[PDB]
Symmetry: C2
Subunit: 174 residues, 2 copies
């Protein structure tokens, strides 16, 4: 039987960067320009199997008060829109907000979203890689529209959170 | 006021992976087959750093909690020898000894050392990248012998520790 893990994660980033679209792509495996997100739902749920380690993860994916939004989160995706430089500048403010609300660091994966929009891209790959490296975060280029690397971003975060759970088990078992 | 930081870091990994050689290349700019202090500047952010670089003498066995060695550490380099698979298998055990001893996670940079030994290499780049990614660690391929990426490994660790210091100040 697989090992079982459960985590709440948060989607972070400025408005219109694709937080809802990425969550819909991951949980419902489609994209719709006219998707209507409803106010009557704090989070989506995904159950994910990781073959490499025979582990099953149940995720609650929260997407925008602030205190309740962050409370209990064990990880997050930190998104920007590669076509809008202001959304990239603001990822640091989102990281700081999350860490201040939780009073601890949690793992974040930096997600450069909308990479399918090649002709209007303004934030270069190397800029995002550098920001992530400076914070020891992983970096993923994604498109909710095409699906490119969307599952990969969430799976990467899941593996990090599992390794942290294991670390904590060892610390409590000395 | 100009930003000054001081960190204790640990060099981790099995015997003969190159912990001393990497530190000697970094602090003294040489390699010879026969704690340490470093001052460095991260000029991109105009940050001055003082490092105290600790490493274990000999080849000690793993301990549930290792007294003294880890106390006060804020980061480390986790080294293996790309020509010896056992040293790669053991990096997880060193990571856990540090975390058990500190009762917290600290940032580690995974360092695949001795990459100059191309014909004898047995641990592939992708294997190290995967291990690092699973823990949200950065990954560097280095050689104390040539000097390749030695400065970069320590500099990246310093920047991570600085960002964590700033996180703590914000929190
Ligand atoms: N081309 C493209 N459009 C996207 C992508 N992700 C989101 N969008 C569009 O960008 C707009 C904002 O997305 P939304 O999910 O509402 O962003 P949120 O405000 O961060 O939740 C919508 O028109 C989406 O259809 C993407 O990867 N590629
Ligand atoms: N070819 C090569 N040899 C190395 C390198 N780093 C260390 N060595 C050699 O490997 C042996 C062990 O290195 P040492 O610094 O004593 O490892 P430690 O036990 O981890 O401190 C010594 O003979 C070093 O000269 C490297 O990058 N390339
Ligand atoms: Mg939305
Ligand atoms: Mg030594």
């Amino acid at each position: 039987m697989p090992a079982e893990y459960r985590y709440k994660i948060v989607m972070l980033g400025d408005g219109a960067v694709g937080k809802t679209a990425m969550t819909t792509r991951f949980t419902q495996n489609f994209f719709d320009t006219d998707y209507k997100r409803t106010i009557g739902s704090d989070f989506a749920v995904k159950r994910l199997q990781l073959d490499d380690i025979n582990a099953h993860v149940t995720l609650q994916i929260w997407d925008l008060v602030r205190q309740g939004f962050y409370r209990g989160a064990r990880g997050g995706l930190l998104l920007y829109d590669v076509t809008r430089r202001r959304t990239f500048i603001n990822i640091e403010n989102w990281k700081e907000e999350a860490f201040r609300s939780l009073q601890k660091e949690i793992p974040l994966v930096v997600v450069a979203n909308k990479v399918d929009l090649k002709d209007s891209r303004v934030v270069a790959t190397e800029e995002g890689e550098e920001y992530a490296k400076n914070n020891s975060f992983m970096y993923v280029e994604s498109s909710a529209l095409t699906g490119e690397n969307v599952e990969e971003a969430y799976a990467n975060l899941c593996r990090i959170m599992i390794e942290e759970s294991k670390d904590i088990s060892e610390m409590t078992s000395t």
